[PDB]
Design an enzyme around this catalytic site. Structure first.
Site, short mmCIF file in Angstrom:
data_model
loop_
_atom_site.label_atom_id
_atom_site.label_comp_id
_atom_site.label_asym_id
_atom_site.label_seq_id
_atom_site.Cartn_x
_atom_site.Cartn_y
_atom_site.Cartn_z
CG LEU A 16 -69.45 -7.75 42.84
CD1 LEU A 16 -70.71 -7.59 43.68
CD2 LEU A 16 -69.77 -8.56 41.61
CD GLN A 87 -62.00 -11.46 41.21
OE1 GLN A 87 -60.88 -11.48 40.73
NE2 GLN A 87 -63.00 -11.28 40.37
CG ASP A 240 -81.36 -2.55 47.57
OD1 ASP A 240 -80.99 -2.81 46.41
OD2 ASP A 240 -80.61 -2.67 48.57
CG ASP A 286 -78.61 -6.47 52.65
OD1 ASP A 286 -78.96 -5.41 52.08
OD2 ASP A 286 -79.42 -7.40 52.81
CD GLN A 290 -73.45 0.00 47.63
OE1 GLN A 290 -74.33 0.83 47.36
NE2 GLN A 290 -72.27 0.36 48.05
CB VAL A 294 -81.87 -0.04 50.77
CG1 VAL A 294 -83.26 -0.56 51.07
CG2 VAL A 294 -81.95 1.36 50.22
CG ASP A 301 -75.36 -0.69 61.20
OD1 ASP A 301 -75.23 -0.36 60.00
OD2 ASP A 301 -74.91 -0.01 62.13
CA LIG Z 1 -79.59 -3.98 50.10
#
Ligand SMILES: [Ca+2]
EC number: 3.1.1.3
Length: 318
Positions: A16, A87, A240, A286, A290, A294, A301
């Site tokens: 992105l 992408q 988030d 995630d 990101q 959060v 993780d």
């Molecule tokens: Ca998140």
């Protein structure tokens, strides 16, 4: 230490991206380059802002090829390890296609190899409304895009161009032009092979994704979805904004038969090479740790997953 000390440099290929050439991109893989470096990885992050598609003559794939050659010069290395998100996985595919001898592996993290149903939906809305914006869901996505990259006098048109590349049609054609042993049959929802010897060069092909958004029950013709990364009253839903936004986009996808997704890429579209897992309670961001680290209560993780994988590569001899 040497835990993540692969033989060949790791290059993190973001997906992105905004339109401004002169952008900043270090914090997309939030907290990941440092972590990898602490463990001995020599990590380089590509900035491919201002390029839209991968396969043009002046596109992202050619940009990334440039960067791969620069990294190699800087390091005295002969091959690199590409890790791509969204992408980013598709443009990592381009470099490996086009320059087999420079690539040691291609890892995909939530790449819409068979497109995105949300991207499809957006192209339809735009038939009627060129701005998208009468659809709140699209508007949600636009704000998330903007938060992850920045307004740089805009968020709106960049957000939409980001999805253009990712439609089912678009990827259908890409794959036709850029065959990989890593892809399974169209429509089979199975992967290909773990490796590929292209131009005398064998390639380690990997992928993983998150299926945090799950379908639930159809009532009156509409099928629900659930975010399974969050817990009841999860703070991640407030702290988030992408958490609920990607449940909304993900619910649209589900009602277009995607069927388990991170809110942008479905489980089946994600699959490439050796699929490490698609069981992660992650939505699309995630994956790259990101919106500033959060995650919901049940999300694994991101940073450990990627590190464990760069060590995997170290163990495979790349
Ligand atoms: Ca998140």
């Amino acid at each position: 230490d040497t835990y993540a000390a692969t033989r060949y440099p790791v290059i993190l290929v973001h997906g992105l991206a905004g339109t401004d050439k002169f952008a900043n991109v270090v914090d997309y893989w939030y907290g990941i380059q440092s972590d990898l470096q602490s463990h001995g990885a020599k990590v380089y992050v590509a900035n491919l802002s201002g390029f839209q598609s991968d396969d043009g003559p002046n596109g992202r794939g050619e940009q990334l090829l440039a960067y791969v050659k620069q990294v190699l010069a800087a390091t005295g290395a002969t091959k690199v390890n590409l890790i791509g998100h969204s992408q980013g996985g598709l443009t990592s595919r381009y470099v490996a296609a086009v320059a087999p001898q420079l690539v040691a592996s291609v890892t995909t993290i939530g790449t819409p190899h068979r497109g995105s149903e949300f991207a499809d939906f957006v192209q339809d809305v735009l038939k009627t409304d060129p701005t998208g914006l009468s659809s709140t869901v699209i508007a949600a996505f636009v704000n998330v895009f903007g938060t992850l990259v920045s307004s740089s006098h805009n968020t709106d048109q960049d957000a939409l161009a980001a999805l253009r590349t990712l439609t089912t049609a678009q990827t259908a054609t890409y794959n036709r032009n850029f065959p990989s042993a890593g892809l399974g049959a169209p429509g089979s929802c199975q992967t290909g092979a773990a490796t590929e010897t292209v131009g005398g060069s064998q390639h380690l092909l990997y992928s993983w994704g998150g299926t945090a958004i799950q379908p639930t029950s159809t009532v009156l013709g509409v099928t629900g979805a659930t975010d399974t990364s969050t817990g009841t009253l999860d703070v991640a839903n407030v702290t988030d904004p992408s958490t609920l936004a990607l449940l909304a986009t993900g619910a649209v996808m589900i009602n277009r038969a995607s069927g388990q997704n991170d809110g942008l890429v479905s489980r089946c579209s994600s699959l490439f090479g050796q699929v490490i897992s698609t069981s992660y309670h992650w939505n699309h961001l995630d994956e790259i740790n990101q919106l500033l680290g959060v995650r919901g209560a049940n999300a694994e993780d991101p940073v450990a997953v990627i590190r464990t994988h760069v060590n995997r590569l170290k163990l495979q001899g790349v």
